[PDB]
């Protein structure tokens, strides 16, 4: 219960709020005890979707074991594993209040989250988070991320000028973003929000991808390109810092990262 | 459309986000163009309530003329003037999309906002803001403040330690806050939020004041004491800086204030 200090920035090295007043989530900006209590009072349930198709099933065991140690501990969690191999899903032991469902299955993540968010998820979960499976948790990822809509700063681009962002640059594409436009480059590997905002986003990105396909065009970075266009027009109500999406082998451990929470393991 | 810069704090002198990740609103933290568009897309209507009882009617003309120049310009605004003298309300000319209603009338602000927020306001307005009438606008006060629930940092106390906060300290009072507790000292002269959150707050503070009265007790700073207790337990989703509530004669123009927006003129 340290008293917040009005005259001392929570960080002096990084931007902790966007120009539309969305928090940018970094270590030092939040008190987890306050936040945990706010979300427990609502009995919050968090859905986490992950796709593990073909060879990617090999990633699930470490993904699930580390999510058990770091993800939303103390809160209700429902993992949704989309896989082409139901029997290759490992039996990881889960903490109390946590469950896993197997859902048997470029355009494909968006469409499938969109279909299932309109069935099951509504309904089962208050927030939906969508990540890649070839990842491991190494530190706390909790209710600090939760908000109607969020994206995550891509670890390769957070220091970049917008012209260097690998947005879709061809105006023939639904994901087109002009050269003088763009707040941030968001990574496709970590986004989420309330179920409603997630249904809206994945529905938009899936509808935009079909339009692009009917026109014989594929956005340069696929659903990530559409994600960026969607979050340009519908601004996230929190942005995660790259603590939440890192590759240490590629990028090290710079000084602005006080924690590496969710990292790549060596669409 | 300057690109937000990830590696440069929007401010280096002040805290721009609370530990529960609510934005603290200061000049330099927001782009008004982005925000104006977000709220216009929803056709947002802002209610502003002010009490002008007895001698305080003399404050209304400057209050209204300066609100016309600075308050929510470009958005729909409904002023609600609670007064004991209907005919002493000056006929200030209003910009398009803006209207004023006269409502003829310690415990009294909370109860009356609570009654009218449940009738008229619902209904008429998306957000309700409640200020004192002995004030003038001098600079921009816009949709940057709008959020489910906000309070404002009291200009006298934002540099203070919590023990020096003039919270109600007697445990016999509903407004009691213990010595080791407290985030901020909020001023009673500027609070608001969505109509629903305002109905909840004013209903809580009014019910708590009756309880205190039935027990022969009056909180040290009256409804302000209850406001602080309410915002301790139900944390605002934005905090306004003291740009939004200043007294220049008393306190000058310190360096951390880049704008004085809404000020005292020389319950
Ligand atoms: C060693 C290869 C370096 C590639 C770094 C840039 O990351 C890629 O960026 C594009 C958009 O410009 C996509 O976002 C793509 O998925 C990113 O690659 C993945 O992320 C990086 C950080 C690293 O883990 C790569 O091995 C991933 O394939
Ligand atoms: C010259 C008198 C100085 C009083 C400053 C402290 O302000 C008062 O603080 C209490 C709580 O401790 C109440 O919030 C009270 O309404 C405040 O006074 C008003 O605000 C100040 C900034 C100044 O404008 C006073 O003249 C007002 O009466
Ligand atoms: O054959 C595949 C290709 C992709 N994916 C899923 O989609 C993600 C994105 O691709 P990778 O992770 O293939 O991309 P980068 O994240 O671009 O390396 C993977 O993590 C998996 O979750 C999968 O399950 N099987
Ligand atoms: O006789 C009164 C006393 C108070 N008020 C209203 O309640 C506010 C709070 O009191 P003052 O402004 O009297 O207090 P500080 O804000 O404590 O000087 C005033 O601005 C008016 O809006 C009023 O209208 N008539």
Q: Is the CB of B193 under 6 A from ligand 2?
A: no
Contacts with B52 (C-beta within 8 Å, 6 or more apart), sequence order: B59, B60, B63, B81, B82, B83, B85, B88, B89, B133
From the number of C-beta atoms within 10 Å of its C-beta (0-12, 13-18, 19+), residue A60 rates as buried
CB B141 within 8 A of CB B72: yes
CB B112 within 8 A of CB B82: yes
Cα–Cα distance, B224 to B222 (Å, whole number): 5
A151 vs A230, A244, B158, CA distance in Å? 10, 10, 32
* Residues of chain A contacting B5 with CB distance shorter than 8 Å: 15
Contact yes or no for A6 and B159 at CB 8 A: yes
Contacts with B62 (C-beta within 8 Å, 6 or more apart), sequence order: B136, B265
Contact yes or no for A15 and B10 at CB 8 A: yes
Residues 180-219 of A with CB under 8 A from B: 180-184
The verdict on whether residue A247 carries a ligand-binding annotation is: yes
Which residue's CA is the nearest one to ligand 4's atom 20?
A: B132
Helix axes B195-214 and B108-116, enclosed angle (nearest 10):
140
Q: Is the CB of A245 under 6 A from ligand 3?
A: no
The verdict on whether residue B51 carries a ligand-binding annotation is: yes
Q: How many CA atoms lie within 13 A of A155 on its CB side?
A: 21
Nearest-neighbour CA in chain A from B9: distance (Å): 4
Cα–Cα distance, B137 to B65 (Å, whole number): 9
Instruction: Using alpha carbons, select from A69, A72, A64 the residue that is nearest to residue A91.
Output: A64
Residues 13-72 of B with CB under 8 A from A: 13-25, 29-31, 34-35, 38
List the single residue in A with minimal CA-CA distance to B234: A38
Two structure tokens written together for A255: 């000084």
Contact yes or no for A4 and B11 at CB 8 A: no
Residue located via tokens 């990617």: A56
CB A169 within 8 A of CB A201: no
Instruction: Give the residues across from B150 on adjacent strands.
Output: B192, B238
Kindly report the backbone phi and psi dihedral angles of residue B79, in degrees, each rounded to the nearest multiple of 5, phi listed first.
Answer: -80, 135
Q: Is the CB of B258 under 6 A from ligand 4?
A: no
Two structure tokens written together for A200: 């809206």
Bond before B123 cis per omega within 30 degrees: yes
Instruction: Using alpha carbons, select from A21, A25, A2 the residue that is nearest to residue A241.
Output: A25
Nearest-neighbour CA in chain A from B90: distance (Å): 36
Q: Is the CB of B190 under 6 A from ligand 2?
A: no
Helix axes B223-233 and B108-116, enclosed angle (nearest 10):
60
Cα–Cα distance, A242 to B131 (Å, whole number): 40
Two structure tokens written together for B132: 């004192």
Contacts with A126 (C-beta within 8 Å, 6 or more apart), sequence order: A42, A44, A45, A46, A194, A195
The phi-psi region of residue A158 (left if phi > 0; otherwise alpha if psi is between -120 and 50; otherwise beta) is alpha
Contacts with A52 (C-beta within 8 Å, 6 or more apart), sequence order: A59, A60, A63, A81, A82, A83, A85, A88, A89, A133
Candidates A1, A12, A20, partner chain B, best to mutate (most B CBs within 10 A): A20
Q: What is the DSSP string of chain A?
A: -PPP-TTS-S-SSS--B-TBSPBEE-TTSB-HHHHHHHHHHTT-EEEEEEEE-GGGGGGHHHHHHHHHHHBSTTSEEEEEEEES-GGGS--PPPPTTEEEEEEE---HHHHHHHHHIIIIITTT-SEEEEE-SSEEE-S-B-GGG-SSEEEEB-TTTTTS-GGGS--B--TTSTTB--TT--S--B-TTEEEEEHHHHHHHHHHHHHHHHHHHHTT---TTTHHHHHHHHHHHS--SEEE-GGGSB-HHHH---TT-S---EEE---
Contact yes or no for A16 and B18 at CB 8 A: no
Strand pairing report for B135-137 and B262-264: antiparallel
Residue located via tokens 């340009």: A232
B160 vs A5, A6, B221, CA distance in Å? 9, 9, 17
Buried b (16+ CB within 10 A) or exposed e, B227-251: bbbbbbeebbbbbbbbbbbbbeeee
Nearest-neighbour CA in chain B from A82: distance (Å): 32
Two structure tokens written together for A67: 């999510």
- Domains in chain B and their CATH numbers? 1-267 (3.90.550.10)
Cα–Cα distance, B52 to B60 (Å, whole number): 7
Cα–Cα distance, B224 to B86 (Å, whole number): 27
B26 vs B149, B154, B241, B251, CA distance in Å? 17, 14, 6, 18
Contacts 24+ apart (CB under 8 A), B91-97: B92/B60, B92/B61, B92/B64, B92/B65, B92/B68, B93/B68, B94/B68, B95/B68
CB B138 within 8 A of CB B260: yes
Cα–Cα distance, B196 to A40 (Å, whole number): 22
Residue located via tokens 């993800």: A71
A144 catalytic? Reply is no
Instruction: Using alpha carbons, select from B4, B105, B98 the residue that is nearest to residue A161.
Output: B4
Instruction: Using alpha carbons, select from A139, A186, A143 the residue that is nearest to residue A162.
Output: A186
Cα–Cα distance, A258 to A11 (Å, whole number): 11
Smallest Cβ–Cβ distance between B14 and the set A9, A11, A183 belongs to: A9
Experimental approach: X-ray
User: Does any CB of chain B come closer than 8 Å to the CB of residue A9?
Assistant: yes
Cα–Cα distance, A107 to A119 (Å, whole number): 19
CB B241 within 8 A of CB B30: no
From the number of C-beta atoms within 10 Å of its C-beta (0-12, 13-18, 19+), residue A164 rates as exposed
From the number of C-beta atoms within 10 Å of its C-beta (0-12, 13-18, 19+), residue B87 rates as exposed
Cα–Cα distance, A175 to A209 (Å, whole number): 8
Two structure tokens written together for A260: 């590496």
Cα–Cα distance, A22 to A19 (Å, whole number): 7
Cα–Cα distance, B112 to B120 (Å, whole number): 12
Q: What is the DSSP string of chain B?
A: -PPP-TTS-S-SSS--B-TB-PBEE-TTSB-HHHHHHHHHHTT-EEEEEEEE-GGGGGGHHHHHHHHHHHBSTTSEEEEEEEES-GGGS--PPPPTTEEEEEEE---HHHHHHHHHIIIIITTT-SEEEEE-SSEEE-S-B-GGG-SSEEEEB-TTTTTS-GGGS--B--TTSTTB--TT--S--B-TTEEEEEHHHHHHHHHHHHHHHHHHHHTT---TTTHHHHHHHHHHHS--SEEE-GGGSB-HHHH---TT-S---EEE---
CB A39 within 8 A of CB A143: yes
Cα–Cα distance, B172 to B65 (Å, whole number): 43
Cα A150 to chain center, whole Å? Answer: 7
Instruction: Using alpha carbons, select from A176, A174, A149, A151 the residue that is nearest to residue A165.
Output: A176
Strand pairing report for A190-194 and A127-131: antiparallel
Cα–Cα distance, B167 to B203 (Å, whole number): 20
Candidates A3, A34, A186, partner chain B, best to mutate (most B CBs within 10 A): A3
Contacts with A222 (C-beta within 8 Å, 6 or more apart), sequence order: A106, A188, A267
Helix axes A195-214 and A108-116, enclosed angle (nearest 10):
140
Cα B152 to chain center, whole Å? Answer: 6
Instruction: Using alpha carbons, select from B165, B183, B172, B231 the residue that is nearest to residue B204.
Output: B231
Strand pairing report for B135-137 and A149-152: unpaired
Instruction: Using alpha carbons, select from B25, B32, B39, B128 the residue that is nearest to residue B75.
Output: B39
Instruction: Give the residues across from A176 on adjacent strands.
Output: A168
Instruction: Give the residues across from A24 on adjacent strands.
Output: A239
Which residue's CA is the nearest one to ligand 2's atom 3?
A: B250
The phi-psi region of residue A246 (left if phi > 0; otherwise alpha if psi is between -120 and 50; otherwise beta) is beta
A24-25, strands of its sheet edge to edge = A24-25, A238-240, A149-152, A190-194, A127-131, A45-52, A76-83, A98-104
Contact yes or no for B15 and A7 at CB 8 A: yes
């Amino acid at each position: 219960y340290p008293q917040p200090k009005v005259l001392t920035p929570s960080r002096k090295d990084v931007l902790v709020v966007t120009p539309w007043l969305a928090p940018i989530v970094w270590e030092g900006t939040f008190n987890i005890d306050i936040l945990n209590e706010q979300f427990r009072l609502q009995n919050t349930t968090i859905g986490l979707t992950v796709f593990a198709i073909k060879k990617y099933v090999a990633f699930l065991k470490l993904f699930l074991e580390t999510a058990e140690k770091h993800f939303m501990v103390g809160h209700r969690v429902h993992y949704y594993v989309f896989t082409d191999q139901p029997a290759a899903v490992p039996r990881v032991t889960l903490g109390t209040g946590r469950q896993l469902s197997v859902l048997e299955v470029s355009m494909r993540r968006m469409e499938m989250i969109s279909d299932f968010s309109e069935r099951r998820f509504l309904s089962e979960v208050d927030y939906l988070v969508s990540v890649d499976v070839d990842m491991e948790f190494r530190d706390h990822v909790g209710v600090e991320i939760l908000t109607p809509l969020f994206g995550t700063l891509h670890p390769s681009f957070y220091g970049s000028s917008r012209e260097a962002f690998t947005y879709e640059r061809r105006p023939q594409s639904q994901a087109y973003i002009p050269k003088d436009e763009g707040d941030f480059y968001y990574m496709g590997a970590f986004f989420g929000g309330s179920v409603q905002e997630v249904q809206r986003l994945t529905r938009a990105c899936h509808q935009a991808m079909m339009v692009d396909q009917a026109n014989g065009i594929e956005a340069v970075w696929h659903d990530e390109s559409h994600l960026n266009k969607y979050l340009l027009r519908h601004k996230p109500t929190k942005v995660l810092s790259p603590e939440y999406l890192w590759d240490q082998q590629l990028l090290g451990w710079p000084a602005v990262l006080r924690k590496l929470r969710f990292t790549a393991v060596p669409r």
